[PDB]
């Protein structure tokens, strides 16, 4: 027998309680980062390596620009929840 909750992975764009940021002209931060790593490494890296590099790109390359100063120079870190039992390659 195996747990009914096993082998799930949730790749959240941000941590619980926080905003997720989206540029209207070039898309959301998380998706921008997710599709650059995937286009470069989707077939040769494990899913946790891919998502860890996405965490780094979102955390380092993005900073809020808003006219409202309450929303200015804000940061974001994504959130991976893994119930996987094996390594995952799309290869």
């Amino acid at each position: 027998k195996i747990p009914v909750e096993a082998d799930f992975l949730f790749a959240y764009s941000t941590v619980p309680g926080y905003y997720s940021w989206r540029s209207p002209g070039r898309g959301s931060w998380f998706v921008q980062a997710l599709c650059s790593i995937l286009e470069e490494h989707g077939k040769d890296l494990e899913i946790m390596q891919i998502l860890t590099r996405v965490n780094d790109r979102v955390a380092r390359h993005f900073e809020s620009q808003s006219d409202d100063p309450h929303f200015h120079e804000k940061k974001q870190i994504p959130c991976v929840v893994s119930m996987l039992t094996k390594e995952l390659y799309f290869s």
Binding site: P3, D7, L9, F10, C35, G42, H70
Partner: protein, 140 residues
């Protein structure tokens, strides 16, 4: 022995839910840029080998029905399943066009006891949405 078995006919289905326009009752504004997200996501997951279908401006009943009928399909020849949600959100909940529905109720359809053809196979969920209204001020 330490990798998921990927020797199947298909990589699997990937459902993209792209919610951009919301009812006035919800109070939520238009998510400009999410179309560039879904198109880029469609090409990258298609390039991975997924069979991608994009649904646009979905209700909470439609989102529950999409994922329940995908749960009820035959995945014996698929290696995995992927779902991508692009919408507004609060903590533990994802926005339809007409309100909010709990993310746990969307993903529970694929539990081991409720979708046997994905047993021991990875079920992946990518969620671009807010989870609250806190801001990360950062640190230098």
């Amino acid at each position: 022995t330490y990798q998921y078995n990927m020797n199947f006919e298909k990589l699997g289905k990937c459902i993209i839910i792209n919610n951009k326009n919301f009812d006035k009752v919800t109070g939520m504004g238009v998510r400009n840029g999410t179309d560039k997200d879904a198109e880029a996501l469609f090409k990258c997951f298609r390039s991975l080998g997924f069979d991608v279908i994009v649904y646009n401006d979905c209700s909470c009943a439609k989102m529950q029905d999409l994922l329940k009928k995908a749960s009820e399909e035959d995945h014996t020849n698929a290696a995995c399943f992927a779902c991508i949600l692009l919408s507004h959100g609060e903590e533990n909940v994802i926005y339809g066009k007409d309100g909010v529905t709990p993310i746990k109720d969307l993903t529970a359809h694929f539990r081991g006891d409720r979708c046997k053809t994905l047993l021991e196979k990875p079920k992946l969920f990518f969620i671009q949405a807010c989870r609250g209204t806190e801001l990360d001020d950062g640190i230098q």
